[PDB]
Design a protein around this nucleic acid. Structure first.
Lengths: 129, 205, 149, 79, 123, 79
RNA sequence: CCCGCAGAAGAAGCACCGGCUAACUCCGUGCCAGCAGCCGCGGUAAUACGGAGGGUGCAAGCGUUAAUCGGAAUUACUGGGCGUAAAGCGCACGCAGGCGGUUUGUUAAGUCAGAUGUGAAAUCCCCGGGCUCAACCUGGGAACUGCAUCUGAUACUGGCAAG
RNA sequence: UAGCUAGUAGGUGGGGUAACGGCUCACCUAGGCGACGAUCCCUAGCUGGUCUGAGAGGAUGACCAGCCACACUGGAACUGA
């Protein structure tokens, strides 16, 4: 990317959700390992392998259950220059809470249940559905 | 401030019988139901979309005798209260003083019992009430005061609504001066023809 | 069984060497009150024969849509080719606070508790396409959980 | 000690008196954007011990002159 | 638009103007009857209508339609204006209070009385 | 010169005061340092027609507030 | 406020009726008189003008005008657009502005968390009292989305340091 | 309406107010504010809240309540907490 590494990643993934390729790959900062170690665990994709040490870079495995593809409607919201630092008792539940809401907390990125369990919100990263 | 002149021709407009004139043979057409809303009488009522909502707002207003200023206050009260907007609206109608005095035996028709409310006769829970919207809370006795216990028409009223269904949500002494607003009248023990969809969706704009 | 409903009827003309031949359109939907809905389209040269042919158009091609409580449960946005439809799930006892064409498709699904809005164009041919796409895109909590894990 | 408001020096062409701007973020009240906004307030100091371009710690004081109600406490930056 | 194009200048309004310029924030103004004119409407109409230019009290002079069914106007006395423009005649953006100071009612209408100077007939 | 007079937020012919610890020279009922206590001459077994939290008057007597007549009714019309 | 006696006895208007918009048929007039909020009606059979029966809605008021928001996603931050529908300066480097590749350290301003202050009472809101009910009067709560301070947090972002 | 400003901007001093003070008078210094909208002309009293909107947002400031401003039109002061 030039001027957001995480926004321009989220174009790269769901273009794989429009031709149903197997593996996708983007140049991977240490933040970017902490991105898809949430999407795997909540079940939206399957497996990933970092590789490279002068170009640290990922091998994400997609997940399309049918002709239907699992990662339906992912959206970045906090785009740079429009930071929305949510207080935690405003929190965006995604699609009546049926999805997950990736929030950049202190204690990590892994965020469904920061509403009650962790107990501190922050900058939204992206809605996920 | 109520509808005076004719009474049954309004039932000829709204299809089925509204209980304004009842207990006698006028069930089966002493006025030719569905035959004369007016001059152009038995005609072609080519209905519309707005109509089948507008008929229902003037169905249950005209079954109880409530004009348009007052019926919207029952609507706007039926939003702040917990639960269904429609079902609370029928609950707030059934708790009305005149609606209770009718189907707790007293009076031939609701318009009579309204006049029996407004002529100092009815007494709620030891208290004189001559206002036709004192909205009764549960576990309260209805009562007719002593100086109008038997005048003409009290004793002949109970027998007519006793062929009508005995409702669950009230208790009543057929002997004398004793009732109980028991609990909330549900949707099941309603007249079951009134469609609460078609009033909530009317005033919402 | 099923349940019909019209939408409208136009004054569709045409032009031949002679004059102005008219026609009539008939927009209907069909849905049994349990979740499946369908629609059709059909013309004629008079009024009542148009309905008769378009009514069978909807008695096939009824699409499978699951409901939750006589209502929707999660806010899909529906758009189809001229118009935007914004359906929010709401409480029980709320009526279908809705505009034109989607009233016909919601009181045939079994849907009875939705507040929703038409956002842009108000042209009832293209409105009724969108809300069927709006209910097509949805997912029940079974479709949530069984697909992700 | 108040907050020890940090600031800069903009200009010194005055006799024992300086001009301080203060970096300051804010939510823009209707759009939700962060505009870096700065103010400009005269600050009393005697020794000329801060130069044009430094970083300055400031507390309030008695209103000495017109247009100037802040004394320097100390400096954390050379020119 | 971009966020930093709405920042440096706000969303300006879509300004709305008044088309009854005999307000001065008022609903009814007094007038002292310049003439009575009998001009003609445009193409889809016919049957020339009854208008009067009116000398106001704010300082203006403007015209007004004298509707009803026949009128009563000697032309050096008082009328009262109503607004609500006629579509037909070019320039008449008012009406007259049918039954007011010096401009009395119409000769025996019997439906929609109150919008003209017709009261209860005999009972 | 601080006083403990009573305000008047009632209906027509239905007074319902407020126990108001306020200033002397100010309004009929428009200003108070603080408000504690209320009153009603329409009790007739409604409820308690007086409820004062007497410690706060025992606070503001200690400052030196001169007390007024109908409150001086209440301090013995409560025990 | 309660009580006593007459005698149905003193007490019903107002707009609309072509479409939107709930309610229709006839006489009179014939592009004249007239209506009207837009669409429009009248030039011999006017469900639209004038009149009469009948109907509709509301009610001690009903219509008309004036005035603000709403429908208007029609100034759009949540919620727009610009290839032809109004709209990409004729084109270039660029100053102040806005915006960061990539790793570690670190500070704690941005933001999150925790309290403590404070946001006058009255309205709005929820359970509860009092006028024969309701308007209205009212007890306590919640809320007043705020700003300033201490304590905490280091994932994002931000200044300093190192790549 | 893009330039404005000399008691203007700052410092020693005296003098001055209940109080810090350019609040005033001599003297030195030559500044001060401004595209994050100064001077300018036009218009307007401000808030708690009312109205409307599902919300944001939009027009409002009559009534009861907070705070200033003004007493026919221009001035200056006396007394006095």
């Amino acid at each position: 990317s030039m001027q957001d590494p995480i926004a321009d990643m989220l174009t790269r993934i769901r273009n794989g959700q429009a031709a149903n390729k197997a593996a996708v790959t983007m140049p991977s900062s240490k933040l970017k390992v902490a991105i898809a170690n949430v999407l795997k665990e909540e079940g939206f994709i399957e497996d990933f392998k970092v590789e490279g040490d002068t170009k640290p870079e990922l091998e994400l495995t997609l997940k399309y259950f049918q002709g239907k593809a699992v990662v339906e409607s992912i959206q970045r919201v906090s785009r740079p220059g429009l930071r929305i630092y949510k207080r935690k008792d405003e929190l965006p539940k995604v699609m009546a809470g049926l999805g997950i809401a990736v929030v950049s907390t202190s204690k990590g990125v892994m965020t469904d249940r920061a509403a009650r369990q962790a107990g501190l919100g922050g900058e939204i990263i992206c809605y996920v559905a | 401030a109520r509808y005076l002149g004719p009474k049954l021709k309004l039932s000829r407009r709204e299809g089925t019988d509204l209980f304004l004139k009842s207990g006698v043979r006028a069930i089966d057409t002493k006025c030719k139901i569905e035959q004369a809303p007016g001059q152009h009488g038995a005609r072609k009522p080519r209905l519309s979309d707005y109509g089948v909502q507008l008929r229902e707002k003037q169905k249950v207003r005209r079954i109880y005798g409530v004009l348009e200023r007052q019926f919207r206050n029952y609507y706007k009260e039926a939003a702040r209260l917990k639960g269904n907007t429609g079902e609370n609206l029928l609950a707030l109608l059934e708790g009305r003083l005149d609606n209770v005095v009718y189907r707790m035996g007293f009076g031939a028709t609701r318009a009579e019992a309204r006049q029996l409310v407004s002529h100092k006769a009815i007494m709620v829970n030891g208290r004189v009430v001559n206002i036709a919207s004192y909205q009764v809370s549960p576990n309260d006795v209805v009562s007719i005061r002593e100086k109008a216990k038997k005048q003409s028409r009290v004793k002949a009223a109970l027998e007519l609504a006793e062929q009508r269904e005995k409702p669950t949500w009230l208790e009543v002494d057929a002997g004398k001066m004793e009732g109980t607003f028991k609990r909330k009248p549900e949707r099941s023990d309603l007249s079951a023809d009134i469609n609460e969809h078609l009033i909530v969706e009317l005033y919402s704009k | 069984e099923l349940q019909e409903k019209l939408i409208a009827v136009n004054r569709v003309s045409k032009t031949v060497k002679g004059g102005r031949i008219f026609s009539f359109t008939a927009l209907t939907v069909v849905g049994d009150g349990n979740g499946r809905v369908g629609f059709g389209y059909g013309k004629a040269r008079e009024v009542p024969a148009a309905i008769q042919k378009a009514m069978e158009k909807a008695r096939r091609n009824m699409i499978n849509v699951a409901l939750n409580n006589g209502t929707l449960q999660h806010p899909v946005k529906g758009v189809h080719t001229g118009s935007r439809v914004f359906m929010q799930p709401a409480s029980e006892g709320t009526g279908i606070i809705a505009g034109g064409a989607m009233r016909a498709v919601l009181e045939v699904a079994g849907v009875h508790n939705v507040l929703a809005k038409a956002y842009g164009s108000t042209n009832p041919i293209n409105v009724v396409r969108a809300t069927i796409d709006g209910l097509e895109n949805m997912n029940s909590p079974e479709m949530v959980a069984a697909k992700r894990g | 000690k108040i907050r020890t408001l940090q600031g800069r020096v903009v200009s010194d062409k005055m006799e024992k008196s300086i001009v301080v701007a203060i970096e300051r973020f804010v939510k823009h009240p209707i759009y939700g954007k962060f505009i870096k906004r700065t103010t400009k307030l005269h600050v009393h100091d005697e020794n000329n011990e801060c130069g044009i371009g430094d970083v300055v710690e400031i507390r309030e004081c008695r209103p000495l002159s017109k247009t100037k109600s802040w004394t320097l406490v100390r400096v954390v930056e050379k020119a | 638009a971009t966020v930093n194009q709405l920042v440096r200048k706000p969303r300006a309004r879509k300004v709305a103007k008044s088309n009854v310029p005999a307000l001065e924030a008022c609903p009814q103004k007094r007038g002292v009857c310049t003439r009575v004119y009998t001009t003609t409407p445009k193409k889809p109409n016919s049957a020339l209508r009854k208008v009067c230019r009116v000398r106001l009290t704010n300082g203006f002079e403007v015209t007004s339609y004298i509707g009803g069914e026949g009128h009563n106007l000697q032309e050096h006395s008082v009328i009262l204006i109503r607004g609500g423009r006629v579509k037909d005649l070019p320039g008449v953006r008012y009406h007259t209070v049918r039954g007011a100071l010096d401009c009395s009612g119409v000769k025996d209408r019997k439906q929609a009385r109150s919008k003209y100077g017709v009261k209860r007939p005999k009972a | 010169m601080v006083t403990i007079r009573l305000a008047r937020h009632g209906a027509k012919k239905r007074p319902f005061y407020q126990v108001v610890v306020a200033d002397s020279r100010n309004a009929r009922n428009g200003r108070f340092i603080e408000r504690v206590g209320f009153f009603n001459p329409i009790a007739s077994e409604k409820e308690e027609g007086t409820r004062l939290d007497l410690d706060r008057i025992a606070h503001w007597v200690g400052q030196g507030a001169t007390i007024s007549d109908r409150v001086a009714a209440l301090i013995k019309e409560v025990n």
